[PDB]
Symmetry: D3
Subunit: 87 residues, 6 copies
């Protein structure tokens, strides 16, 4: 299915960024910064702002381990999905 | 981007199903059952069974208006995304 | 303030039904049914139907104690709020 | 009914502050501070400190669009309700 | 520490039921029925009723794969604590 | 039963810290500080850093009353469990 394909897509993009550094299944502040700035540049306003990136990071990182795992990632998909529907 | 592409895809699928009947911007049970069985067939177990479909509908429709609106639909992406990353 | 008065309003309405029976601070299915059918009759579709009332009770009672307490009630005020704004 | 009046009341108050500037349908940081400091003065601790208003704004604005829309505002009502029943 | 001790306790108890049948690391409807009725009988009302066990299983199995995984099980702890501090 | 004993355990630790200052039934920052660093040292990363204790305090304190009450505490239990299982 296309819907399935879009889902595997999102999953693929997650890993695309999570493997660069440290844990392969988790995103570091730095990797999330990349993901955010390159992949949602037209979705989240001011995503370019150091403060905006930090605020998003601190909020996904529910368990304070300094990493964003896949389950925490889902939150971001939901926010983004909200924006994309608004346009 | 790609990520933005996928998210736009998801939005577009919603609407692919929501305009068939009643309100254009929301899914009725019928509409939701179509979307589930053909677009998540390989994602949610037993998704074809009547009981599962009803259970999922009853859960999304948080405000009991017998419609699944976009906000409510986000939750399903969440459930699905979970599953898709699992495979 | 006006906003403070409406919030005090909702708390008072909650007690208005929670004292009828059993614990004074919680709603039983009965007390909830009365509240729903007499105070949200124009907010939630088919609120009069048995099925709907139970589905609602079954969802608010997160701890499964057969009582809806105030924190659990706040959920209902959220659904209700969505509803009112949409009508508006 | 009364419960319904109170709800419509809260929606009204929302609109009373959202129409002063920018989109009519949403609350700016500024609009939000106004409502907080004169509508909730006797509900949230130290709600008259810049720090506390920032924090509430930052939390209610989940999509980071620098605006607080009605669905996001509902969370504010939840926090408030909590406080009001405590008295 | 003691808190750590209790948390480890909970995980342990999860496992003592999850390994009985099927996947070792997730709970089947049967496995859960066993955990609820034996470990939570003085905590959740009417936990010995067929109907309640199922409503609790249906609720926990957020992804409809007919198993309760540790993440899903965490919500049971939340429901239970609420009750425990009540006594 | 053991699970029940662990739950009660969790409630007792909470109170062990909550009775120290101000209201016996809620944790002040200071009280929360102690609890975190003495009961979760081997569970949450850098729990020792003043920045992290503050961030955790700010997240639990949903109503902004500068106390963490039992309900709000349950979120902390969930973050911790998640970690303890991961270990
Ligand atoms: Ca990484
Ligand atoms: Ca952090
Ligand atoms: Ca994390
Ligand atoms: Ca439709
Ligand atoms: Ca329903
Ligand atoms: Ca709905
Ligand atoms: Ca009562
Ligand atoms: Ca129930
Ligand atoms: Ca209850
Ligand atoms: Ca405005
Ligand atoms: Ca922000
Ligand atoms: Ca916003
Ligand atoms: Ca098993
Ligand atoms: Ca199910
Ligand atoms: Ca499951
Ligand atoms: Ca205290
Ligand atoms: Ca704060
Ligand atoms: Ca608090």
């Amino acid at each position: 299915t296309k819907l399935e394909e879009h889902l595997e897509g999102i999953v693929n993009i997650f890993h695309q960024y999570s493997v660069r550094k440290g844990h392969f299944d988790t995103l570091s502040k730095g990797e999330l910064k990349q993901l955010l700035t390159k992949e949602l540049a037209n979705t989240i306003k001011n995503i370019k702002d150091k403060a905006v990136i930090d605020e998003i990071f601190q909020g996904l990182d529910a368990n304070q381990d300094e990493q964003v795992d896949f389950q925490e990632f889902i939150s971001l998909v939901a926010i983004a999905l909200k924006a994309a529907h608004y346009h």
